[model samples]
Target: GGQQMGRGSEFVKPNYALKFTLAGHTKAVSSVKFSPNGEWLASSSADKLIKIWGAYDGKFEKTISGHKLGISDVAWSSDSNLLVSASDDKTLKIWDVSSGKCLKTLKGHSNYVFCCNFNPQSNLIVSGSFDESVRIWDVKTGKCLKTLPAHSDPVSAVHFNRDGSLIVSSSYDGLCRIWDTASGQCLKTLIDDDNPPVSFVKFSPNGKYILAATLDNTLKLWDYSKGKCLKTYTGHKNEKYCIFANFSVTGGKWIVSGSEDNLVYIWNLQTKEIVQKLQGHTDVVISTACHPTENIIASAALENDKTIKLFKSDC
Candidate 1:
């Protein structure tokens, strides 16, 4: 149905331009995500708050404040009716978006809760924490279904596959592991030669591979079944912080990541070529989320630049 723009030449790069910049969070904005329905943008900050905005125009919508400590991450349900917020206070709060009210607070982690996400069905949540554990919880009862001693060090990222049958986690211990959701068994342990600390890792949209961000300044796509790296994407500085990343199936197959160099790097997943470098942040760009349906990107930065910037392209 569409074939006019992109894929002709690298010289004809897709025109991704800055669309809007929102000034909201007072401290470091840890994460920014667009609702799966692609109408509302939710952002979490180290200031113990979450803000909602219009995805199309960056118009302010609502503020959610209840977390006792700084929020580490935020994820939206597939239905876009609920949000899960992880915090240094060692709890994950599920918020019902319609009323801006906290619905349930899931607790059990002995240390800071680092990352979390709602399963595709929105009936479950998978979360990781500094307690070196990964937990699966039932959203309806706020009950911990399973608590897997996942890593030796802090877990940096955790997410479920599209079908909600598998979960993937990355950690400071230098490995990425895939777990069988039903059995709670480790199916694969994906590791690199040097065993670099994996900052962020998630199952790809199709549920076939893992998109991983290594602290060694590289992002890799791994065939977990074979324990092999299928693609290598670099040109982003990520030597220290655990930067967020994702796959964009909008105009083309693109890989996106926030960088310590204060830029958002987008790569063509097919050609492994740098497609665009979005610049706006004045500090480390630690979080990024591509729009669910468009060639639009939302990037958030650290303390110095606590703003969320949006970029878009028609072609």
Candidate 2:
């Protein structure tokens, strides 16, 4: 399951009562993600602070506060030694997690930096921004490698395929585009006019599929190889601002999604049907992640009052 951070935070353990409530953020938590090693959790906030917490317990770890503006996104490298964050301050930063020192500051975007990702195979990183471009960077040298100027609106999210062969991005223009990492060529475009907007796009662990969640409150799956729509899962009554549909770690037979409709849906890959809906949040779910090693799921939800709540799924 994914780790979550926000107001009224609690660690949900199987067959156990709520572990503890972690309180620190003065405003809404914008992003919460676990380290690749699953030992630490990092959260970005509108309060202009990034906090780190212990994965096993809700213990306070450390906070990084240097951004001049609110942080929009945070990510951990595959090696788990580095943490990267993007902000509305129009900057991206890399940090040495152990020493809590800023290693590098990547500057290029002309507007708010929205999202960033580290390619699994190399020290290369890709970041998207409100400037309507995606920039690839060399992590070690702090050099801009390449830039993609395709989307007309703000690029909301960017992610690389597990093998690093493809990069996928979503924008406020209601399109998801696949790019060839080698040439930076726009390979294919996935557009949904009926939906409000797509906020996130991700590749399934095995690389056979891509899952996208939109403002229309639906999660759509695509066949990456064929570049075609495979299935659409819908049950959210409101816009699904954030969605995570990752394969179960125990096996690849199942995929799960957390939605803004205050529910998380677990689906059967073969049947393409919702097997169960896990309900806990009282508001909109903004982010979610599946456990790399277990069936547990972690999610962040925003209530009507705009408070963030964390949910952990047992199944």
Candidate 3:
């Protein structure tokens, strides 16, 4: 009983501009993430602290301190009430966002806990460690549920698929492995000839593809179901440290990554072309994350430039 809308409502060409620059971490910034509700932004640092800020206005909210060593990564619960932080202290801690108190400390890794993430249901957490294993923990009981011998070398990153049925891990052994969450079985191993150290691995929002950042100065896209390398994205420097890559909110049409060149590069998924290169950081861009529902991005830099920069696009 109403008029139908067409696809040509408005074609806004993608345009990006620097929105805000947040500076606070005393040491190198390791990770930056937006909360599930997109109201809060959290950044972890090698200074052994985590800082919260207003996502839109860049207002300082609070500082969370407890880790004995540098914090490696941080993840927020689905409800945004809790935060889990992995640390070089060889442990992971869950903290209450409101009270700013450590709720539980899960310890088992023999070495540094490099990365972690909460599952979709927020009942479990999967972490990768320098001990060359991926461990799953029960959030409620603070117990280790399962340990998967993931790689031959230090495990860099671990992530759960959208459905929480599978776990993907990247490692210094130059391989990305997909494991069965329930059975703790290695379902598939993604590798190439060079065998370069894999820094990070992430699943696409739709669960159709996996992106791996490697020390070989390239980002590889894989078809998880087919067990094949779909494409390799290059043209940026990433050899010095472990950098991260992510997909844009625009239907995953673009891929974004930080580089040792101190710039953030965005590529067109279909054309395999570098569409834009963003410059603002004065040091190595360590990590970049796209907003959950907006054309916005947040990036963190290395020691000399320990700040988080936000980029927004009008599309």
Candidate 4:
């Protein structure tokens, strides 16, 4: 069990400390997500459970248990009332966030579903799997909309572009590809044959650029329109197992990234420089998400000691 250190940004820090703490997962926390309104937090873990918490108090609100195997990821609907979880059981389940009732079970992935996300405007869900494909689903009908032919290797992550017109995916094949959401055609491929496989790829909130983190411990930003690599931010000397980089949702001028180096970095995108390095996770940082309204960030890890941590930047 973990204690509630504090709650909101408005809550006065005991000694003017810039950060707070969130702790709960009994096993490695696979993912941490903030609600659409940023009022609640949901975390999925290898413990085979999904825990819901109050963003402010860190008080455990609910525990959703169903998946027999470890959970891989969890996503909240745009309305913030529904939660969808992916698991090693190769099924994706939707749950009512308010009651924690299983709304539906979506099964199509031939192997484990590694990650999943819902479209903000549509009743559609998308998932990437170790089966080496990305499947789009109609949540209401529980029908597979389309299965996109993707990486030959297991797909690690798949995300919709901010505009929802395109999707991007990363895989063990050492490349990232952008796809047309409707047609499911690969539009562009970012391949670095010499480097280790890329672990994750995300689109900037503005949809103007793409960011990818590799096992080589480098974060690369590319101009999607120009189809060229724009910049690279190197944070750790050691290899990174995963990375999450995104622009500030509140219209800030910085980009944030968390790495396996056990560090979170805030980068000045305009100047192409790192502004700060946040360090606290005793184990490797495996997943991360930025607050929808604040400059705060939540990160998860593969460590048993501390599975999740929060960080705030002054920049």
Q: Which candidate leads in lDDT?
A: 1
Order of models, best TM-score first:
1, 3, 4, 2
Which candidate has the highest TM-score of all? 1
Each candidate: what lDDT? 0.91, 0.73, 0.88, 0.77
Candidate 1's residue-wise lDDT over 189-252, tens digit each?
9987789999999888888889999899999999867889999998889999989999987776
Error of 4 at 244 (Å): 2.7
Give the least accurate 10-residue stretch of model 2, judged by summed lDDT.
9-18
Which tens-of-lDDT digit does each residue in 1-315 have in candidate 4?
Answer: 111223534321111123556677788888888898988889998888999877655567889999979988899989998888999999999999898899999998999998888886748888989999989889898899899889888887888887678888898788888889899898998865374687778788778888887778677788988888888777553264555566655534566676666776666665556666677777766777777886667777775455566665432
Off by over 4 Å in 3: 1-13
**Ten-residue stretch with the least lDDT total in model 4:** 9-18
List pairs with backbone clashes in candidate 1: none
Write model 2 residue lDDT over 1-315, tens digit each, in one string: 222224443322222123334567776566777777777777777687888877656577998878889887888899888888989999999988888898999998999998888889658888999999999889998888898995998888898998898899988788899998889999989875473677888888777788887777677788978878878776654353544445655433455666666665666555566666766566655655555654435555553423333434343
Off by over 4 Å in 4: 1-18, 192-195, 237-240, 313-315
Task: Mark the 10 consecutive residues where model 3 has the least summed lDDT.
Answer: 1-10
| Runs with alpha carbons beyond 4 Å of true place in candidate 1 | 1-12
Question: How do the predictions measure up, each by TM-score?
Answer: 0.96, 0.85, 0.95, 0.89
Q: What ranking emerges by lDDT with the best candidate at the front?
A: 1, 3, 4, 2
Model 1 Cα shift for residue 206 (angstroms): 0.6
In candidate 1, what residue range of length 10 has the lowest lDDT sum? Answer: 1-10
lDDT of 3 by residue, 142-254 (tens): 99999888898988888889999999999989899999999999999989768889988999887879999999789888899999888888898987587878978643367
Give lDDT for model 3.
Answer: 0.88
